[PDB]
Symmetry: C2
Subunit: 110 residues, 2 copies
C-alpha cells in the first residue's frame, strides 16, 4: 500500500478493493470486475486474457487523450482512449464475453 | 508493426507517429508528446518521469471506467480515468512542467 495507485498490483492478498477501491458508478471510480476477479486480482486464472488488452506505458501515452486538472484534491492526470479488439481473432467472441462479464458486474452484488 | 496497438513500444527506430499515429485534436487521436518525445519514444531522455504515471495492467483495469462500444470500424474497449500526482513528491513541480510540455504540444508544431 506504499506504491502509487497506478503502479499497484492486485492479488488475493491485496485485492482489487484494497488496491483500487470499491467498484461503482462514479466518474473516476473503477467499474471493472466480478466477485471472482475482485477477490483475486492478477491471481485470476483468466487474467492473461484480460491483460492482453492493457496498454504498455508507451501505448498509454501514445494512444490516449491526456489532460491535467488542478482541483483542490490535488493535481490529476486525466486519460481517455479506446482499444480495438481483433474481430479476425478466432478467440474474439470469447474476448467480448470475458470483458462483458466484468464490466459493471458490481451492480448485481453488494 | 504486427503487434496489437496497445502492446507497441515506441523507440527511435519505431517512433510514436509510426506506432500510434500523428498527434491531433480528434477523440480517436492521441494528443501527448512534443517533437522530441515523438521522435524518440521510450528512448526519450525524460521517459522514466513520464512512465511513472502509466498504469500497471492491474491498475488499468482496477482504476479505469471500462466500456465496450461497437462502431462501424469494430468493437472497442473504452477506458477513462484520473491519476493523482503526489504533491509531497519533491519532483512535483518538475512533473507539472514535463506534462505541460507534452500535452497538446502538436498545436505549435511547424
Amino acid at each position: 500500500s506504499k506504491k502509487p495507485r497506478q503502479k499497484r498490483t492486485a492479488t488475493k492478498a491485496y485485492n482489487v478493493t484494497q488496491a483500487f477501491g470499491r467498484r461503482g458508478p462514479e466518474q473516476t471510480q473503477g467499474n471493472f470486475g466480478d466477485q471472482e476477479l475482485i477477490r483475486q486480482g492478477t491471481d485470476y486464472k483468466h487474467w492473461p486474457q484480460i491483460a492482453q488488452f492493457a496498454p504498455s506505458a508507451s501505448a498509454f501515452f501514445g494512444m490516449s487523450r491526456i489532460g491535467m486538472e488542478v482541483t483542490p484534491s490535488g493535481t490529476w492526470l486525466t486519460y481517455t482512449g479506446a482499444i480495438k479488439l481483433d474481430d479476425k481473432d478466432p478467440n474474439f467472441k470469447d474476448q467480448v464475453i470475458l470483458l462483458n462479464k466484468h464490466i459493471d458486474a458490481y451492480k448485481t452484488f453488494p
